Paper text:
Histone lysine demethylases antagonize the action of histone methyltransferases in a site- and methylation state-specific manner. The jumonji-C (JmjC) domain-containing enzymes constitute the largest class of histone demethylases, and the family is predicted to include about 30 human members. These enzymes utilize Fe(II) in a 2-oxoglutarate-dependent dioxygenase mechanism to remove methyl groups from methylated lysines of histone tails. JmjC-domain demethylases are linked with diseases, including androgen-dependent prostate cancer, obesity, and X-linked metal retardation, suggesting that these enzymes may constitute novel targets for therapeutic intervention.
We were able to crystallize 5-carboxy-8HQ in complex withJMJD2A to investigate the inhibitor interactions within the active site environment. The structure revealed that 5-carboxy-8HQ is positioned in a similar location to the 2OG analogue N-oxalylglycine in complex with JMJD2A and Ni(II) (which substitutes for Fe(II)); the 5-carboxy group of 5-carboxy-8HQ and the C-5 carboxylates are positioned to interact with side chains Lys 206, Tyr 132. X-ray crystallography was used to rationalize the mode of action of this novel demethylase-directed scaffold: 5-carboxy-8HQ occupies the 2OG binding site, and kinetic data indicate that it may indirectly affect the binding of the peptide substrate. A comparison between the present structure and structures of JMJD2A with substrates or other ligands, such as 2,4-PDCA, highlights a notable difference in the ligation of the active-site metal and the His276 residue: the hydroxyl group from the inhibitor interacts with His276 while the nickel ion (substitution for iron) formerly bound to the same His is now shifted away from that amino acid. Although it is unclear whether the observed shift in metal position occurs in solution with Fe(II) complexed at the active site, it highlights the possibility that inhibition of 2OG oxygenases by metal-chelation at their active sites may involve movement of the metal. Our findings, and those of others, demonstrate that 8HQ may provide an attractive generic template for generating inhibitors of 2OG oxygenases, and that inhibitory selectivity can be achieved through substitutions to the 8HQ core. The 200 µM 5-carboxy-8HQ treatment inhibition of JMJD2A was greater than treatment with 1 mM PDCA dimethyl ester or 2.5 mM DMOG indicating that 5-carboxy-8HQ is the most potent cellular JMJD2A inhibitor identified to date. Notably, this compound does not require modification to a “pro-drug” ester form in order to be active in cells, as do the previously reported N-oxalylglycine derivatives. In the assay, the present 5-carboxy-8HQ inhibitor displayed a strong concentration-dependent effect, restoring the trimethylation pattern at the H3K9 locus in cells overexpressing the JMJD2A/KDM4A demethylase.
Author numbering: 8 to 354
Amino acid sequence: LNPSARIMTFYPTMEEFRNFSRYIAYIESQGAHRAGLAKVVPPKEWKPRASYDDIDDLVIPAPIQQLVTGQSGLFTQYNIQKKAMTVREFRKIANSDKYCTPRYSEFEELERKYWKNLTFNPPIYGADVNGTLYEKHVDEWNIGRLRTILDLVEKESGITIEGVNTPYLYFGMWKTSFAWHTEDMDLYSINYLHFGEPKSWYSVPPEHGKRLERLAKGFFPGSAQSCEAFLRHKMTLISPLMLKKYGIPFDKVTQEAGEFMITFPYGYHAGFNHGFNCAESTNFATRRWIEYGKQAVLCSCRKDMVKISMDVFVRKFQPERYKLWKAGKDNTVIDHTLPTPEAAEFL
Ligand SMILES: O=C(O)c1ccc(O)c2ncccc12
Ligand code: NI
Ligand SMILES: [Zn+2]
């Protein structure tokens, strides 16, 4: 139902909003997932926190300086880790005259300045901060407890993986970036921008993901040779012009404060922050993900790589396939357009 696989936007009513799992099934039934990325504007009367005036003392244990290098729309991003700092001192830096958002009229203009000045004046990104900004009693779309089947991991093994089955906070300033990547184990993610300047996103349809990898391997032959999935290192930036020039289908969308972005299995995404802002994210799953999890190609070169045992999911949700899967003979091919089984009630 999304032939053009464009990025859809949904405005759920407070009743529709209440059950998270259920609503994800609904937007998949609308074809949202085909774009790789989808936006969800929450009911006006929804708020996850009363005031963000109390966080100035919150610690960012490991702010990152993002050094980018390259030319002609192809870049590699190197992380230089800085000393800890509080949200307050970070916001002074972000708003300071050297790190703050350039002046501009339309978005396209800011986008052009980003791709022009990307390798200059390296910003700091308050990334991967363990925490949440939700109030204990928020029962709608609480990133800390979404109740999806991804809960099986910690439930059956006690295993937690920071930012994956726990939430992460990201304090951005102008010109800070996330490189091109799909999620760990090719999961879904949910991103909520608590406050501040927009965050803009690019995405390639999962249907065309393989194209983007082909392109990437040609541009960084070295990295590709050394690691089966070097894009998972999250150091590879590629401008939209470069994508256009080589025929990769992609779409754009700007996320403003108070909106959600949902990433879908094997949806490659990237983007940048407009200025000082704050976001929370974690991963989650649906039944549709299980198969992606089984076939996710994982980083083969680094020790600190996330690898979830699919075993528990295969027994509980694909019992008839388990033996065949452990014998390495499960040849299921994935149809990236099919909606998740739970969406049948909406069809
Ligand atoms: O930092 C971000 O804005 C961001 C956005 C979307 C993602 O999928 C990310 N994944 C890993 C780290 C950061 C991000
Ligand atoms: Ni991510
Ligand atoms: Zn690797």
